[PDB]
Write a protein that binds this ligand. Sequence first.
Ligand SMILES: Nc1c(O)cccc1C(=O)NS(=O)(=O)NC[C@H]1O[C@@H](n2cnc3c(N)ncnc32)[C@H](O)[C@@H]1O
Ligand SMILES: [Br-]
Ligand SMILES: [Cl-]
Ligand SMILES: [Cl-]
Ligand SMILES: [Cl-]
Ligand SMILES: [Cl-]
Length: 389
Amino acid sequence: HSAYVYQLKAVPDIFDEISQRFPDRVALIFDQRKITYRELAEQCSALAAVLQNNCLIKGDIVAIKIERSPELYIFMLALMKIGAVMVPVNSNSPERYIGEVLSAAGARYLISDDVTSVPGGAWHVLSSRTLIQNCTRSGNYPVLSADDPALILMTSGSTGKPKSVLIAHRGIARLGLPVPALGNSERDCYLQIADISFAASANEIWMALLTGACLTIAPPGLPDLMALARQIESDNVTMLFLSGGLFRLFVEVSVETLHIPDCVVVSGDFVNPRLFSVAVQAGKAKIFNGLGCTENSAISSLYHIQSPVPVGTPLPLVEMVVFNERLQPCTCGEYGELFIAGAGVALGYSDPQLTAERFITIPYQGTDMLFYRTDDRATYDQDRNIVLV
Ligand SMILES: Nc1c(O)cccc1C(=O)NS(=O)(=O)NC[C@H]1O[C@@H](n2cnc3c(N)ncnc32)[C@H](O)[C@@H]1O
Ligand SMILES: [Br-]
Ligand SMILES: [Cl-]
Ligand SMILES: [Cl-]
Ligand SMILES: [Cl-]
Ligand SMILES: [Cl-]
């Protein structure tokens, strides 16, 4: 439990720390089933021992296709504890496409809650249901470092090129640091709705579970705004992360739901400023425009809208710089490209040539800093907020 904020542990070590400090806080809610950190840590450890005894070891590439459920997050924590590299799969994807993802990721195993609706291939299919039943063993787990790989996520460039992104423990472990703009703590409650195959899901999962906060879990499948509205109220969601689609739809059909939480973060793409205007005038929740990208593991900057919206200022341990064509920091109003450095930067792509092109070391403020090149055109405003253009 170090006070040096730049000193990060692997995910399982942070979670062990949190589960010891807040053992009687609620970690997970699904429907009306609630699970404390103490019970979650017991289930995580029991499952990790089962996985190790199934010969799964550090660095094994392990895909997960498990519908939203408490067991999904138990598997994530157990796989992190044994050092496996998770490949989360979109359960709403054609089997065809899932096979292409598993192939591109090099998955050796696929853990599934429905072993009938999975693609065949080189990978070996394991039943999440059977493995959970075999929980009764725990010890001799790997000594993980913040730079060990934790997951593989798929993304695309601006012109459609598909990419396989290797994410380090540190990229999600940083979400255990409270975000000053949000004021979050263990008292908060998050809503898990973004699909696990999307980096944005990390915002919900790990900001909750690595801080002692509560994660209430949306029902599997496509968004049910009626149920989500009831869930936000009945489970007292206080930190609400939304895609541009979910945000816009809520503004259109139930803007007052957006003011049940304390903070609402909209990320993923440009949002019509008029939508922010309506939302901000409808109540007193803090509405943010947020930037994230897969290559920085999770949400990366926040702009509080008070009334092209800026993307604001970086999260803890994140560095953002707009660089011109000559790799010099831009002045206010000068156009350049957004580069991101710090704890969230990915380990690379599966493509080594693509990695060297997009992950570049640049001396900045006295440090030879590794930057991800976003391909996002940007500048600074007068208050030095970053604004994508
Ligand atoms: N939403 C996410 C999250 O919360 C956590 C982690 C990842 C993501 C995510 O979106 N990852 S991603 O799929 O790789 N897309 C990346 C690309 O999205 C565009 N983008 C994203 N946010 C904004 C925004 N506010 N305004 C304008 N453009 C935006 C930029 O072009 C960027 O480079
Ligand atoms: Br739109
Ligand atoms: Cl407690
Ligand atoms: Cl198919
Ligand atoms: Cl291509
Ligand atoms: Cl790649």
